[PDB]
Write an enzyme that holds these catalytic residues in place. Structure first.
Site, PDB file in Angstrom:
ATOM      1  N   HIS E 200      -7.556  49.381 -63.640  1.00 44.56           N
ATOM      2  CA  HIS E 200      -6.094  49.524 -63.818  1.00 44.56           C
ATOM      3  C   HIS E 200      -5.684  49.531 -65.284  1.00 44.56           C
ATOM      4  N   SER E 204      -7.043  55.933 -62.339  1.00 43.27           N
ATOM      5  CA  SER E 204      -8.140  56.641 -61.712  1.00 43.27           C
ATOM      6  C   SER E 204      -8.523  57.975 -62.355  1.00 43.27           C
ATOM      7  N   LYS E 226      -3.328  57.228 -46.572  1.00 42.17           N
ATOM      8  CA  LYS E 226      -4.698  57.764 -46.567  1.00 42.17           C
ATOM      9  C   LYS E 226      -5.727  56.677 -46.354  1.00 42.17           C
ATOM     10  N   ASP E 227      -5.511  55.546 -47.014  1.00 50.53           N
ATOM     11  CA  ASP E 227      -6.421  54.417 -46.896  1.00 50.53           C
ATOM     12  C   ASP E 227      -6.460  53.836 -45.484  1.00 50.53           C
ATOM     13  N   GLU E 270     -34.825  46.467 -44.849  1.00 52.61           N
ATOM     14  CA  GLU E 270     -33.807  47.249 -44.142  1.00 52.61           C
ATOM     15  C   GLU E 270     -33.546  48.603 -44.856  1.00 52.61           C
TER      16      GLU E 270
HETATM   17  C1  HEM Z   1     -18.269  45.487 -53.458  1.00 57.76           C
HETATM   18  C2  HEM Z   1     -18.426  46.592 -54.169  1.00 57.76           C
HETATM   19  C3  HEM Z   1     -17.301  47.364 -54.728  1.00 57.76           C
HETATM   20  C4  HEM Z   1     -15.956  47.313 -54.469  1.00 57.76           C
HETATM   21  C5  HEM Z   1     -15.192  46.410 -53.513  1.00 57.76           C
HETATM   22  C6  HEM Z   1     -15.376  48.315 -55.305  1.00 57.76           C
HETATM   23  C7  HEM Z   1     -14.003  48.559 -55.306  1.00 57.76           C
HETATM   24  C8  HEM Z   1     -13.438  49.649 -55.926  1.00 57.76           C
HETATM   25  C9  HEM Z   1     -12.144  50.140 -55.663  1.00 57.76           C
HETATM   26  C10 HEM Z   1     -11.175  49.560 -54.653  1.00 57.76           C
HETATM   27  C11 HEM Z   1     -11.949  51.212 -56.478  1.00 57.76           C
HETATM   28  C12 HEM Z   1     -10.715  52.077 -56.548  1.00 57.76           C
HETATM   29  C13 HEM Z   1     -10.721  53.117 -55.421  1.00 57.76           C
HETATM   30  C14 HEM Z   1     -11.806  54.145 -55.594  1.00 57.76           C
HETATM   31  O1  HEM Z   1     -11.727  55.024 -56.477  1.00 57.76           O
HETATM   32  O2  HEM Z   1     -12.789  54.120 -54.829  1.00 57.76           O
HETATM   33  C15 HEM Z   1     -13.122  51.381 -57.250  1.00 57.76           C
HETATM   34  C16 HEM Z   1     -13.286  52.359 -58.214  1.00 57.76           C
HETATM   35  C17 HEM Z   1     -14.476  52.502 -58.929  1.00 57.76           C
HETATM   36  N1  HEM Z   1     -15.639  51.827 -58.722  1.00 57.76           N
HETATM   37 FE1  HEM Z   1     -15.940  50.489 -57.428  1.00 57.76          FE
HETATM   38  N2  HEM Z   1     -16.299  48.950 -56.040  1.00 57.76           N
HETATM   39  C18 HEM Z   1     -17.492  48.429 -55.744  1.00 57.76           C
HETATM   40  C19 HEM Z   1     -18.749  48.779 -56.244  1.00 57.76           C
HETATM   41  C20 HEM Z   1     -18.954  49.699 -57.268  1.00 57.76           C
HETATM   42  C21 HEM Z   1     -20.210  50.128 -57.754  1.00 57.76           C
HETATM   43  C22 HEM Z   1     -21.550  49.649 -57.227  1.00 57.76           C
HETATM   44  C23 HEM Z   1     -19.947  51.043 -58.781  1.00 57.76           C
HETATM   45  C24 HEM Z   1     -20.896  51.800 -59.643  1.00 57.76           C
HETATM   46  C25 HEM Z   1     -22.191  51.528 -59.809  1.00 57.76           C
HETATM   47  C26 HEM Z   1     -18.523  51.149 -58.884  1.00 57.76           C
HETATM   48  C27 HEM Z   1     -17.854  51.931 -59.790  1.00 57.76           C
HETATM   49  C28 HEM Z   1     -16.519  52.304 -59.624  1.00 57.76           C
HETATM   50  C29 HEM Z   1     -15.888  53.341 -60.469  1.00 57.76           C
HETATM   51  C30 HEM Z   1     -16.536  54.111 -61.597  1.00 57.76           C
HETATM   52  C31 HEM Z   1     -14.621  53.475 -60.039  1.00 57.76           C
HETATM   53  C32 HEM Z   1     -13.594  54.427 -60.611  1.00 57.76           C
HETATM   54  C33 HEM Z   1     -13.456  55.676 -59.741  1.00 57.76           C
HETATM   55  C34 HEM Z   1     -12.465  56.704 -60.247  1.00 57.76           C
HETATM   56  O3  HEM Z   1     -11.398  56.402 -60.832  1.00 57.76           O
HETATM   57  O4  HEM Z   1     -12.709  57.916 -60.068  1.00 57.76           O
HETATM   58  N3  HEM Z   1     -17.953  50.337 -57.945  1.00 57.76           N
HETATM   59  N4  HEM Z   1     -14.034  50.409 -56.892  1.00 57.76           N
HETATM   60  C1  HEM Z   2     -21.536  41.267 -48.684  1.00 57.42           C
HETATM   61  C2  HEM Z   2     -21.353  40.408 -47.677  1.00 57.42           C
HETATM   62  C3  HEM Z   2     -22.387  40.107 -46.650  1.00 57.42           C
HETATM   63  C4  HEM Z   2     -23.462  40.872 -46.293  1.00 57.42           C
HETATM   64  C5  HEM Z   2     -23.871  42.215 -46.863  1.00 57.42           C
HETATM   65  C6  HEM Z   2     -24.147  40.152 -45.267  1.00 57.42           C
HETATM   66  C7  HEM Z   2     -25.322  40.650 -44.692  1.00 57.42           C
HETATM   67  C8  HEM Z   2     -25.985  40.030 -43.658  1.00 57.42           C
HETATM   68  C9  HEM Z   2     -27.079  40.576 -42.951  1.00 57.42           C
HETATM   69  C10 HEM Z   2     -27.732  41.921 -43.195  1.00 57.42           C
HETATM   70  C11 HEM Z   2     -27.434  39.657 -42.016  1.00 57.42           C
HETATM   71  C12 HEM Z   2     -28.536  39.791 -41.000  1.00 57.42           C
HETATM   72  C13 HEM Z   2     -27.850  40.372 -39.767  1.00 57.42           C
HETATM   73  C14 HEM Z   2     -28.805  40.400 -38.623  1.00 57.42           C
HETATM   74  O1  HEM Z   2     -29.829  41.127 -38.665  1.00 57.42           O
HETATM   75  O2  HEM Z   2     -28.546  39.698 -37.627  1.00 57.42           O
HETATM   76  C15 HEM Z   2     -26.562  38.556 -42.140  1.00 57.42           C
HETATM   77  C16 HEM Z   2     -26.622  37.438 -41.345  1.00 57.42           C
HETATM   78  C17 HEM Z   2     -25.734  36.376 -41.456  1.00 57.42           C
HETATM   79  N1  HEM Z   2     -24.697  36.286 -42.306  1.00 57.42           N
HETATM   80 FE1  HEM Z   2     -24.169  37.591 -43.565  1.00 57.42          FE
HETATM   81  N2  HEM Z   2     -23.530  38.995 -44.990  1.00 57.42           N
HETATM   82  C18 HEM Z   2     -22.453  38.890 -45.780  1.00 57.42           C
HETATM   83  C19 HEM Z   2     -21.514  37.854 -45.831  1.00 57.42           C
HETATM   84  C20 HEM Z   2     -21.587  36.681 -45.086  1.00 57.42           C
HETATM   85  C21 HEM Z   2     -20.723  35.558 -45.184  1.00 57.42           C
HETATM   86  C22 HEM Z   2     -19.522  35.429 -46.109  1.00 57.42           C
HETATM   87  C23 HEM Z   2     -21.192  34.607 -44.268  1.00 57.42           C
HETATM   88  C24 HEM Z   2     -20.695  33.249 -43.921  1.00 57.42           C
HETATM   89  C25 HEM Z   2     -19.627  32.688 -44.457  1.00 57.42           C
HETATM   90  C26 HEM Z   2     -22.326  35.182 -43.641  1.00 57.42           C
HETATM   91  C27 HEM Z   2     -23.042  34.525 -42.686  1.00 57.42           C
HETATM   92  C28 HEM Z   2     -24.139  35.087 -42.057  1.00 57.42           C
HETATM   93  C29 HEM Z   2     -24.847  34.355 -40.987  1.00 57.42           C
HETATM   94  C30 HEM Z   2     -24.534  32.986 -40.422  1.00 57.42           C
HETATM   95  C31 HEM Z   2     -25.844  35.162 -40.608  1.00 57.42           C
HETATM   96  C32 HEM Z   2     -26.846  34.851 -39.520  1.00 57.42           C
HETATM   97  C33 HEM Z   2     -26.306  35.391 -38.188  1.00 57.42           C
HETATM   98  C34 HEM Z   2     -26.770  36.818 -37.951  1.00 57.42           C
HETATM   99  O3  HEM Z   2     -27.992  37.098 -38.045  1.00 57.42           O
HETATM  100  O4  HEM Z   2     -25.952  37.728 -37.658  1.00 57.42           O
HETATM  101  N3  HEM Z   2     -22.569  36.415 -44.179  1.00 57.42           N
HETATM  102  N4  HEM Z   2     -25.689  38.791 -43.167  1.00 57.42           N
HETATM  103  C1  LIG Z   3      -6.290  48.713 -55.866  1.00 56.72           C
HETATM  104  C2  LIG Z   3      -6.564  50.184 -55.660  1.00 56.72           C
HETATM  105  N1  LIG Z   3      -6.474  50.963 -56.753  1.00 56.72           N
HETATM  106  C3  LIG Z   3      -6.681  52.301 -56.757  1.00 56.72           C
HETATM  107  C4  LIG Z   3      -7.045  53.031 -55.497  1.00 56.72           C
HETATM  108  C5  LIG Z   3      -7.270  54.535 -55.532  1.00 56.72           C
HETATM  109  C6  LIG Z   3      -6.324  55.226 -56.526  1.00 56.72           C
HETATM  110  C7  LIG Z   3      -5.986  54.508 -57.849  1.00 56.72           C
HETATM  111  C8  LIG Z   3      -6.549  53.088 -58.056  1.00 56.72           C
HETATM  112  C9  LIG Z   3      -7.170  52.244 -54.233  1.00 56.72           C
HETATM  113  O1  LIG Z   3      -7.465  52.802 -53.146  1.00 56.72           O
HETATM  114  C10 LIG Z   3      -6.914  50.769 -54.312  1.00 56.72           C
HETATM  115  C11 LIG Z   3      -7.032  49.900 -53.101  1.00 56.72           C
HETATM  116  C12 LIG Z   3      -8.074  48.974 -53.074  1.00 56.72           C
HETATM  117  C13 LIG Z   3      -8.243  48.139 -51.980  1.00 56.72           C
HETATM  118  C14 LIG Z   3      -7.382  48.185 -50.867  1.00 56.72           C
HETATM  119  O2  LIG Z   3      -7.592  47.294 -49.808  1.00 56.72           O
HETATM  120  C15 LIG Z   3      -8.170  46.079 -50.141  1.00 56.72           C
HETATM  121  C16 LIG Z   3      -9.426  45.696 -49.644  1.00 56.72           C
HETATM  122  C17 LIG Z   3      -9.989  44.478 -50.048  1.00 56.72           C
HETATM  123  C18 LIG Z   3      -9.308  43.649 -50.947  1.00 56.72           C
HETATM  124  O3  LIG Z   3      -9.870  42.470 -51.365  1.00 56.72           O
HETATM  125  C19 LIG Z   3     -10.704  42.476 -52.544  1.00 56.72           C
HETATM  126  F1  LIG Z   3     -10.103  41.844 -53.538  1.00 56.72           F
HETATM  127  F2  LIG Z   3     -10.987  43.713 -52.945  1.00 56.72           F
HETATM  128  F3  LIG Z   3     -11.830  41.852 -52.264  1.00 56.72           F
HETATM  129  C20 LIG Z   3      -8.067  44.031 -51.457  1.00 56.72           C
HETATM  130  C21 LIG Z   3      -7.503  45.237 -51.050  1.00 56.72           C
HETATM  131  C22 LIG Z   3      -6.325  49.121 -50.896  1.00 56.72           C
HETATM  132  C23 LIG Z   3      -6.157  49.979 -52.006  1.00 56.72           C
END
Ligand code: HEM
Ligand code: HEM
Ligand SMILES: CC1=NC2=C(CCCC2)C(=O)C1c1ccc(Oc2ccc(OC(F)(F)F)cc2)cc1
Ligand SMILES: CCCCCCCCCCCCCCCCCC(=O)OC[C@H](COP(=O)([O-])OCC(O)COP(=O)([O-])OC[C@@H](COC(=O)CCCCCCCCCCCCCCCCC)OC(=O)CCCCCCCCCCCCCCCCC)OC(=O)CCCCCCCCCCCCCCCCC
Ligand SMILES: CCCCCCCC/C=C\CCCCCCCC(=O)OC[C@H](COP(=O)(O)OCCN)OC(=O)CCCCCCC/C=C\CCCCCCCC
Ligand SMILES: CCCCCCCCCCCCCC(=O)OC[C@H](COP(=O)(O)OCC[N+](C)(C)C)OC(=O)CCCCCCCCCCCCC
Ligand SMILES: CCCCCCCCCCCCO[C@@H]1O[C@H](CO)[C@@H](O[C@H]2O[C@H](CO)[C@@H](O)[C@H](O)[C@H]2O)[C@H](O)[C@H]1O
Ligand SMILES: CCCCCC(=O)OC[C@H](COP(=O)([O-])OCCN)OC(=O)CCCCC
Lengths: 59, 289, 99, 74, 378
Positions: E200, E204, E226-227, E270
């Protein structure tokens, strides 16, 4: 008489208060209708396979 | 000109009075004389007079000189919810004009709409009132320096019109102006009070009683009223229509024209802030009433 | 000279011309380009502004212009070159002086 | 940066309609289908060739693994 | 003035959510950010609800997960939502990164690098998540992958046993993996907020790679609507897996409890790690393989420095487009190869694919940029 969509607007959708009450009433009537209707579709697709269909044989 | 052009698009009401430069440069004398004999006809004309005169004398003078006068229906005009945005950042202040479709000359609702427009009223930077101004739009606009000027209008045409407001403001204030203005429309629709409607009534009573001062405005009122209404409406009749308006009326009348209706928007100048149409259109209702 | 065949091919393949863009509209805005843009005369700047506005609007719709309206390869003036060249030439002088 | 402080634009008019005045899907198939085919043709031999190559290296390698696990006539 | 711009909490919401100036022309590839957010929140809720029923003790662990699926009310739908939700997360992640690569969004350096960190954090989370059921693939996956760190000279062997809290992946490892797996998503949420905080600053990027200040639209309603549509499609994909093929993206061997003697036939992580697992197996030397697996992810941090083209997006760049789609197809090949046994022809294909991965990023796509420039007299 004005069109049906128009009658819907003036009676239900104009005041946001009525719009919301409409949604809550509609949600109740949809829920029961959709559930009952979809269950029928499922149980017809699985005629005689379910415990519900073969229950009578052991009662 | 832009407001009309977009509001009544694809009709003769979209047209400017002066015409496009193309027409001005090409119109021959044949066009002018044909236009005249078609439109300048005795039944589409009124001889009005005011001042020191006997009516009888005017009528006889009309005989003497206007006897030779000879003896084209208007189609209705389609209003469109639309926007015209002439973005020109080089100009120092932004002009915004917004309106919904008004009822047109004949309709009695016009009186109640005038009362409502009087409540919201008008303002500019040289006004004495400031914060203590009665109109909430004006007092908020004055204290926060939102705009340089604004007025509500209600323009009447035959079967239609433009009901809204124009404002001129700083390039950073357009969104806020729109918000407060549309907020006023909604407040009158949903929740106008008796005392503020009384104020609006009193403004309107005073407005049309003091406008008709001296012979020219009175002559014009005669001339045009005969064209639009088919008669001069006496001040005593206007007063009766005004006294009929209470808070309930203002609500019901405003809700007809303002509430949940698509407006016509025209913007000119540094209008980067001027709200998106969807945001403007969503600003035409409240999520409560 | 001989690669002019490929340059003309690449131009159409790249396809920014289909949005009514000239090459210098597609340049990624770094600090030098920003300054070059900032130095453009009213006419050249407002053209740039519109061409982009038009392209973005087309991109929004996922559409292109009619083929008649496409930027011809030959008619693509390098409008930003004189400004950008000098902006760069200037900075390199300051960078030199700093050593 | 807020709306009203983004950038400088001059002499650009934008006309638009209310969503209540217009259709959500004007000429959706009529103009949609040909625009899709144009979009698809435009990118096809940038997008497709590597996935062709994947498909081939995949189906080659799969049944190569099968043949290799069979006994050889010797 | 309104109480959206005034109120200290609403102010942040109004600026980063509602009145946010967004480019008019952003495509479907911009939805993945929002979807990543939904994924994260989805995992946290489902996860928390699972944690109300799970236990990290090695004896009861497998049993608790199955007890969820059989005795806990709608525990099954929660469990499989969480497992397929993890897949949906990684689908969303790679699509989101791909967008960044293709359209050159990585020029937003801070946003990009925080991204890299987020990626690595979600990876760490999902690796430790898959261990929690304490099935075969869980236990054996964790054993092989962790034990790669022993390849570090001098310290490596200690390091591995310190992560484990013992001499194998056992009681102390599972318990701590539960604790780290619980806390990390919350750390992700924080870093994700910093991610947007930097986004921000600039606003974008868009598909053209040309600045969009001349044509911004407010986020509401255009992108709020859209979202919502995107979210709806994400829920469809998720629930299509959960209700019609919940086992499709997992492995069967994780339905038999963990046995420290009995090794599964073809031990593998996985699906979303398979590409990097293949890269590891390409290099014959073990420490080399580990440093390649590590560099296969970290190279993302290097991408911005490798940028050569005078145009930002690949939209107007045919050569780069092909090379990009080659890089995608290569990654699909590495995923396939990662899933295979170590034999002919999968060794050679794997080697050749891993060569092409680093070749595409470090040599070919940079060269292609400069060739494109010289074709435009640049
Ligand atoms: C939990 C993982 C992530 C979350 C929640 C997240 C969230 C977001 C959100 C909400 C936006 C704005 C909407 C969009 O353009 O898609 C954004 C933009 C962006 N994210 Fe992520 N992101 C994540 C991981 C990543 C990763 C792994 C990368 C790169 C390695 C990345 C790079 C970017 C970039 C470059 C933008 C700008 C896009 C643009 O303006 O064209 N993000 N991210
Ligand atoms: C990025 C966020 C997270 C990812 C990617 C993730 C991913 C996973 C995956 C791949 C498994 C194995 C699923 C299966 O084969 O059964 C798993 C299991 C589990 N996750 Fe998560 N997890 C996330 C967040 C959380 C959070 C916030 C909690 C608890 C507060 C949680 C609690 C558990 C528990 C209790 C299991 C064992 C039950 C099961 O196997 O389904 N996870 N998680
Ligand atoms: C905050 C955001 N900014 C922008 C774009 C595209 C266009 C321009 C920049 C988005 O789509 C945008 C957005 C991002 C997330 C949205 O839903 C949420 C999903 C999760 C959320 O929690 C948190 F914090 F990300 F973990 C907070 C919001 C809704 C909208
Ligand atoms: C994992 C989850 C991923 C989520 C992705 C998020 C997608 C998203 O939110 O963006 C909207 C994105 C853009 O579509 P759009 O808003 O119509 O824009 C079209 C362009 O202007 C381009 O317009 P056009 O003129 O080229 O016409 C294209 C036309 C398709 O042309 C055809 O007629 C075929 O429209 C579509 O692309 C929609 C395809 C859906 C067809 C289903 C029938 C309804 O929509 C989709 O990708 C499809 C979703 C629609 C679901 C309909 C289900 C019924
Ligand atoms: C894997 C499956 C990929 C599905 C792709 C669908 C095919 C359609 C398509 O994307 O190609 C067209 C092409 C044309 O785009 P423009 O040049 O911007 O538009 C020109 C005017 N319309 O669209 C795109 O390039 C899409 C944007 C690229 C998204 C990246 C794909 C994501 C999946 C790969 C993961 C990469 C991860 C890297 C991890 C390390
Ligand atoms: C335990 C109790 C829980 C409490 C929760 C309360 C639930 C109450 C349900 C009623 C909700 C209806 C309220 C509402 O108006 O918002 C829905 C939005 C906006 O609709 P919109 O069409 O913009 O507004 C209608 C305006 N009107 C009536 C004046 C003409 O429409 C949407 O965008 C929503 C659908 C998208 C998904
Ligand atoms: C006669 C026409 C030949 C054309 C068709 C080719 C397929 C026919 C089989 C010929 C042999 C192919 O060669 C095959 O390559 C792989 C990968 O290098 C070998 O694998 C071996 O070599 C690599 C070399 O780096 C080592 O790291 C690895 O430890 C080892 O297993 C196979 O053991 C071998 O059988
Ligand atoms: C109380 C209900 C909360 C709510 O849904 O508000 C967000 C909008 C509807 O409000 P609006 O911005 O159209 O109007 C607010 C101004 N009065 O919902 C949409 O996303 C509609 C998009 C289609």
């Amino acid at each position: 008489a004005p069109t049906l969509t128009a009658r819907l607007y003036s009676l239900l959708f104009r005041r946001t208060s009525t719009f919301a009450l409409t949604i809550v009433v509609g949600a109740l009537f949809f829920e029961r209708a959709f559930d009952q209707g979809a269950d029928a579709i499922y149980e017809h697709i699985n005629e005689g396979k379910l415990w519900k269909h073969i229950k009578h044989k052991y009662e | 000109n832009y407001l009309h052009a977009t509001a009544f698009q694809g009709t003769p009401l979209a047209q400017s009075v002066e015409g496009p430069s193309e027409n001005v440069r090409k119109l021959s004398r044949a066009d002018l004389t044909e236009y005249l004999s078609r439109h300048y006809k005795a039944p589409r004309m009124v001889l009005a007079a005011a001042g020191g005169l006997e009516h009888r004398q005017l009528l006889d003078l009309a005989q003497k000189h206007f006897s030779g006068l000879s003896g084209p229906t208007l189609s209705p005009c389609r209003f469109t919810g639309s926007q015209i945005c002439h973005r020109e950042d080089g100009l120092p202040l932004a002009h915004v004009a917004i309106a919904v479709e008004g009822p047109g000359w004949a309709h009695p609702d016009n009186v109640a709409l005038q009362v409502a427009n009087a409540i919201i009223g008008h303002y500019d930077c040289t006004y004495g009132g400031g914060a203590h101004l009665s109109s909430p739009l004006a007092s908020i606009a004055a204290t926060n320096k939102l705009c340089q000027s604004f007025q509500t209008f209600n323009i009447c045409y035959a079967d239609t019109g433009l009901l809204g407001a124009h404002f001129v403001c700083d390039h950073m204030s357009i969104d806020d102006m729109m918000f407060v203005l549309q907020g006023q429309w909604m407040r009158l629709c949903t929740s106008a009070t008796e005392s503020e409607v009384l104020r609006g009534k009193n403004l309107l009573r005073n407005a049309l009683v003091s406008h008709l001062d001296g012979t020219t405005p009175v002559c014009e009122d005669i001339g045009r009223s005969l064209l639009t209404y088919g008669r001069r409406i006496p001040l005593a009749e206007w007063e009766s229509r005004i006294a009929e308006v209470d808070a309930r009326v203002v609500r019901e009348v405003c809700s007809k024209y303002f509430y949940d209706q698509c407006p016509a928007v025209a913007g000119f100048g540094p209008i980067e802030q001027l709200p998106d149409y969807n945001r403007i259109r969503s600003g035409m209702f409240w999520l409560r009433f | 000279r001989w690669l002019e065949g490929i340059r003309k091919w690449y131009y159409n393949a790249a396809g920014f011309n289909k949005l009514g863009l000239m090459r210098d509209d597609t340049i990624h805005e770094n600090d030098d380009v920003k300054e070059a843009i900032r130095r453009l005369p009213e006419n050249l700047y407002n053209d740039r502004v519109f061409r982009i506005k038009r392209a973005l609007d087309l991109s929004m719709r996922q559409q292109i212009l009619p083929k008649e309206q496409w930027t011809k390869y030959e008619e693509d003036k390098s409008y930003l070159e004189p400004y950008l060249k000098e902006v760069i030439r200037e900075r390199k002088e300051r960078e030199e002086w700093a050593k | 940066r807020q709306f009203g402080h983004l950038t400088r634009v001059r002499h650009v008019i934008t006309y638009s309609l209310s969503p209540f005045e217009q259709r959500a899907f004007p000429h959706y198939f009529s103009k949609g289908i040909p625009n899709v085919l144009r979009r698809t043709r435009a990118c096809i031999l940038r997008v497709a060739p590597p996935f062709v190559a994947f498909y081939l290296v995949y189906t080659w390698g799969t049944q190569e693994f099968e043949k290799s696990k069979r006994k050889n006539p010797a | 003035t309104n109480i959206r711009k005034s109120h200290p909490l609403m102010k942040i919401v109004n600026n980063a959510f509602i009145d946010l100036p967004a480019p008019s022309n952003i495509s479907s590839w911009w939805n993945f950010g929002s979807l990543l957010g939904i994924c994260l929140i989805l995992q946290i809720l489902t996860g928390l609800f699972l944690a109300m029923h799970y236990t990290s003790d090695t004896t009861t662990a497998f049993s608790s997960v199955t007890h969820i699926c059989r005795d806990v009310n709608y525990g099954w739908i929660i469990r499989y939502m969480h497992a397929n939700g993890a897949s949906m997360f990684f689908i969303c992640l790679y699509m989101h990164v791909g967008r960044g690569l293709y359209y050159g969004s990585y020029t937003f350096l801070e946003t990009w690098n925080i991204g890299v960190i987020l990626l690595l954090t979600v990876m760490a989370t999902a690796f430790m998540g898959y261990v929690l059921p304490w099935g075969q693939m869980s236990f054996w996956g964790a054993t092989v992958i962790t034990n790669l760190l022993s390849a570090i000279p001098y310290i490596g062997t200690n390091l591995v046993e310190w992560i484990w809290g013992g001499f194998s992946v056992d009681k102390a490892t599972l318990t701590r993996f539960f604790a780290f797996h619980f806390i990390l998503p919350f750390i992700i949420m924080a870093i994700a907020m910093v991610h947007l905080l930097f986004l921000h600053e600039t606003g974008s990027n868009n598909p053209t790679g040309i600045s969009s200040d001349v044509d911004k639209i407010p986020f509401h309603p255009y992108y709020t609507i859209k979202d919502i549509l995107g979210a709806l499609l994400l829920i469809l994909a998720l629930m299509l897996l959960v209700l019609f093929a919940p086992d499709l993206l997992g492995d069967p061997d994780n339905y038999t409890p963990a046995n420290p003697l009995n090794t599964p036939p073809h031990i593998k992580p996985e699906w979303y790690f398979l590409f990097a697992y293949a890269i590891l197996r390409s290099i014959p030397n073990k420490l080399g393989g580990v440093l390649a697996l590590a560099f296969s992810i970290l190279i993302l941090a290097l991408i911005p420095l490798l940028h050569t083209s005078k145009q930002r997006s690949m939209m107007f760049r045919p050569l780069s487009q092909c090379l990009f789609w080659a890089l995608v197809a290569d990654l699909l090949t590495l995923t396939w190869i990662g899933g295979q046994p170590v034999e002919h022809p999968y060794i050679t294909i794997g080697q050749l694919a891993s060569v092409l991965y680093f070749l595409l990023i470090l040599v070919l796509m940079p060269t292609a940029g400069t060739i494109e420039n010289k074709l435009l007299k640049w």
